[PDB]
Design an enzyme around this catalytic site. Structure first.
Site, PDB file in Angstrom:
ATOM      1  N   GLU A  35      -5.928 -16.450  -9.425  1.00  0.00           N
ATOM      2  CA  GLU A  35      -7.044 -16.341  -8.487  1.00  0.00           C
ATOM      3  C   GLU A  35      -6.836 -17.210  -7.260  1.00  0.00           C
ATOM      4  O   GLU A  35      -7.006 -16.761  -6.120  1.00  0.00           O
ATOM      5  CB  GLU A  35      -8.353 -16.737  -9.191  1.00  0.00           C
ATOM      6  CG  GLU A  35      -8.890 -15.617 -10.055  1.00  0.00           C
ATOM      7  CD  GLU A  35      -9.279 -14.364  -9.292  1.00  0.00           C
ATOM      8  OE1 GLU A  35      -9.452 -14.397  -8.052  1.00  0.00           O
ATOM      9  OE2 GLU A  35      -9.416 -13.318  -9.964  1.00  0.00           O
ATOM     10  N   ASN A  46     -14.451 -11.811   2.451  1.00  0.00           N
ATOM     11  CA  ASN A  46     -14.309 -10.358   2.292  1.00  0.00           C
ATOM     12  C   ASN A  46     -14.999  -9.590   3.408  1.00  0.00           C
ATOM     13  O   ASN A  46     -15.908 -10.106   4.071  1.00  0.00           O
ATOM     14  CB  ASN A  46     -14.897  -9.946   0.938  1.00  0.00           C
ATOM     15  CG  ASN A  46     -14.253 -10.734  -0.185  1.00  0.00           C
ATOM     16  OD1 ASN A  46     -13.022 -10.725  -0.305  1.00  0.00           O
ATOM     17  ND2 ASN A  46     -15.055 -11.427  -0.968  1.00  0.00           N
ATOM     18  N   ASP A  48     -17.063  -7.261   3.082  1.00  0.00           N
ATOM     19  CA  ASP A  48     -18.412  -6.817   2.714  1.00  0.00           C
ATOM     20  C   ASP A  48     -19.460  -7.876   2.999  1.00  0.00           C
ATOM     21  O   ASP A  48     -20.658  -7.768   2.711  1.00  0.00           O
ATOM     22  CB  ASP A  48     -18.445  -6.389   1.249  1.00  0.00           C
ATOM     23  CG  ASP A  48     -18.394  -7.545   0.274  1.00  0.00           C
ATOM     24  OD1 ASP A  48     -17.997  -8.668   0.649  1.00  0.00           O
ATOM     25  OD2 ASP A  48     -18.760  -7.319  -0.898  1.00  0.00           O
ATOM     26  N   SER A  50     -19.410 -10.879   1.720  1.00  0.00           N
ATOM     27  CA  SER A  50     -19.314 -11.886   0.674  1.00  0.00           C
ATOM     28  C   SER A  50     -18.040 -12.730   0.806  1.00  0.00           C
ATOM     29  O   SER A  50     -17.079 -12.331   1.460  1.00  0.00           O
ATOM     30  CB  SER A  50     -19.303 -11.248  -0.712  1.00  0.00           C
ATOM     31  OG  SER A  50     -18.080 -10.615  -1.040  1.00  0.00           O
ATOM     32  N   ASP A  52     -15.375 -15.377  -1.639  1.00  0.00           N
ATOM     33  CA  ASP A  52     -14.950 -15.896  -2.931  1.00  0.00           C
ATOM     34  C   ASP A  52     -14.596 -17.369  -2.766  1.00  0.00           C
ATOM     35  O   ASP A  52     -13.844 -17.702  -1.862  1.00  0.00           O
ATOM     36  CB  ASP A  52     -13.734 -15.150  -3.474  1.00  0.00           C
ATOM     37  CG  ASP A  52     -13.996 -13.658  -3.599  1.00  0.00           C
ATOM     38  OD1 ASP A  52     -15.115 -13.316  -4.010  1.00  0.00           O
ATOM     39  OD2 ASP A  52     -13.119 -12.825  -3.294  1.00  0.00           O
ATOM     40  N   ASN A  59     -17.649 -15.162  -6.444  1.00  0.00           N
ATOM     41  CA  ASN A  59     -18.206 -14.409  -5.325  1.00  0.00           C
ATOM     42  C   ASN A  59     -19.649 -14.709  -4.978  1.00  0.00           C
ATOM     43  O   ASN A  59     -20.551 -14.867  -5.813  1.00  0.00           O
ATOM     44  CB  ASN A  59     -18.052 -12.908  -5.655  1.00  0.00           C
ATOM     45  CG  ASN A  59     -18.411 -12.034  -4.478  1.00  0.00           C
ATOM     46  OD1 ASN A  59     -19.534 -11.547  -4.440  1.00  0.00           O
ATOM     47  ND2 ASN A  59     -17.492 -11.842  -3.545  1.00  0.00           N
TER      48      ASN A  59
END
Length: 129
Positions: A35, A46, A48, A50, A52, A59
């Site tokens: 990760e 991201n 969208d 969001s 991480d 997220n």
């Protein structure tokens, strides 16, 4: 901070991840490796809306609040910045919720693709826990 493999394994064991919900320690180490490359400050922004955050790339739509994500649920009840410290406590506590609340380690794309079906015990072989 960038963790060493055994160092991270020891910290995760002290935070009770070994055999948490039936997932051996090695699964957790393996997921962190793919990760974030064991980087506690990793962030992935991201398209969208969001982001991480941290060593397990949690997220912001579902698990933490960063004030900037649409439809945020904040189910770990933490600001996303708490997931960016060298102390892994907040990420571990939220990761437990995630495997809990949701359904297993399949929640982490890197686990699903890079750890699932492998010898995960190798990630903790040689370490002194």
């Amino acid at each position: 901070k960038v963790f060493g493999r055994c160092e991270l394994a020891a910290a995760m064991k002290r935070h009770g991840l070994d055999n948490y919900r039936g997932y051996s320690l090695g699964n957790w180490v393996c997921a962190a490796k793919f990760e974030s490359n064991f980087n506690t400050q990793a962030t992935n922004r991201n398209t969208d809306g969001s982001t991480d955050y941290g060593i397990l790339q949690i997220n912001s739509r579902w698990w933490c609040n960063d004030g900037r994500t649409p439809g945020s649920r904040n189910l770990c009840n933490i600001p996303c910045s708490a997931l960016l410290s060298s102390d892994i406590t907040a990420s571990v506590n939220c990761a437990k919720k995630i495997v809990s609340d949701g359904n297993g380690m399949n929640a982490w794309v890197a686990w699903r693709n890079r750890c699932k079906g492998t010898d995960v015990q190798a990630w903790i072989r040689g370490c002194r826990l």
